[PDB]
Paper text:
For tg-[name] mice, which harbor the Dutch (E22Q) and Iowa (D23N) mutations within the Aβ sequence, we observed three different polymorphs. The other two polymorphs, labeled DI2 and [name], consist of a single protofilament and account for 37% and 11%, respectively. For [name], the atomic model consists of residues A2–G33. However, as described for DI2, this atomic model was built into a map with a medium resolution (4 Å) and therefore has limited accuracy. The model is the most likely one based on its fit to the map and the fact that it yielded the highest score in the side chain assignment method. The overall [name] fold differs from the DI1 fold and aligns only in residues V24–G33 with the DI2 fold. Therefore, secondary structure assignments differ from DI1 and DI2, showing two β-sheets in the N-terminal domain. The fold of [name] fibrils is mainly stabilized by a salt bridge between E11 and K28i+1 and a hydrogen bond between E11 and S26i+1. The C-terminal kink in the structure around K28 is stabilized by a hydrogen bond between N27 and the carbonyl group at G29. Additionally, a hydrophobic cluster around V18, A21 and V24 stabilizes the overall fold.
Alzheimer’s disease is the most common form of dementia and is neuropathologically defined by the presence of extracellular plaques containing Aβ in the brain parenchyma and intraneuronal neurofibrillary tangles containing phosphorylated tau. Peptides between 37 and 43 residues in length are generated, with those of 40 (Aβ40) and 42 (Aβ42) residues in length being the most abundant. These Aβ monomers tend to aggregate into insoluble fibrils, the structure of which has been extensively studied in vitro by cryogenic-electron microscopy (cryo-EM) and solid-state nuclear magnetic resonance spectroscopy, revealing a spectrum of different polymorphs. Two human fibril polymorphs have been determined: ‘type I filaments’, which are mostly associated with sporadic Alzheimer’s disease (SAD), and ‘type II filaments’, which are observed in familial Alzheimer’s disease (FAD) and other neurodegenerative disorders with amyloid brain pathology. Here, we determined the structures of nine ex vivo Aβ fibrils from six different mouse models by cryogenic-electron microscopy.
Author numbering:
A (entry chain D), B (entry chain E), C (entry chain C), D (entry chain B), E (entry chain A): 2 to 33
Amino acid sequence: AEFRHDSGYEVHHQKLVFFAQNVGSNKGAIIG
Amino acid sequence: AEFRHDSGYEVHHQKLVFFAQNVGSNKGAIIG
Amino acid sequence: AEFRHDSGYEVHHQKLVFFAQNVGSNKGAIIG
Amino acid sequence: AEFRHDSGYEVHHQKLVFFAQNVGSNKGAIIG
Amino acid sequence: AEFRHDSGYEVHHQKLVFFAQNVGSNKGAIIG
């Protein structure tokens, strides 16, 4: 399996976030 | 299997998010 | 498995974030 | 598994962040 | 597992950050 993405764009304006993980942008491994 | 995506665009304005993971944009591996 | 991303762009303006991990941009390993 | 990223760009303007870890940009290992 | 990143760029302007760890840019190991 492979996941190929090119030239992504992102804008983030999160408000009032609690108990979150990687809130915003995530591109790496995250384990709960 | 393969997943090919080109020139994605995203805007995020999440509010009042609790106990979330990778809230916003996610492109990497996440394991629960 | 592989995850290939090229020339990503990101802008972050999070406000009022509590108890978060890697709030903003994340590209490395995070373990809960 | 592998995670390959090239020429990333990031701008961070977080405000009012409490009890956060690696707030901003993260690319290394973080353990809770 | 491996995490390969090349020629990253980052600009940080965090304001009003409390009880944070590695606020700004992080690329090393952090343990809670």
